[PDB]
Design a binder for these strands. Structure first.
Length: 48
DNA sequence: CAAACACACCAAACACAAGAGCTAATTGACTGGCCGTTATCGATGTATATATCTGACACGTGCCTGGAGACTAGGGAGTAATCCCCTTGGC
């Protein structure tokens, strides 16, 4: 899932590729059609 | 003019970002030099297989010696008569 080179993996993004959650058809669909913002996790701001 | 401290500004870092609880899955180093084992290539044979030449045995052909065949020449071996020497026989 590290969208970058192996040597500098930590410098690249994380979670870009995830394991498809095959727990129930609805979950599969939701997963295949999901988004994710690059903003840092748990940011103090609340506009985004 | 040089030195004391004070203020405003600029530049440089520190540490924090609730309590946790469960589950899943990606990473399982790598060229090179060198020593140490071992596999392979090579020589240096001696053992066995096959080919050439020599020796002994076998079948076959042969040159040579002696033997054998037909025919001949002509004389050696050989009937038929004869003599009478000599032997066997006698008193």
């Amino acid at each position: 899932g590290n969208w970058g080179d192996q040597k500098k993996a930590h410098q690249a993004r994380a979670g870009v590729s995830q394991v498809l959650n095959r727990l129930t058809f609805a979950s599969t669909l939701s997963h295949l059609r999901r988004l994710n913002s690059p903003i840092g996790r748990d940011g103090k701001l609340a506009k985004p």
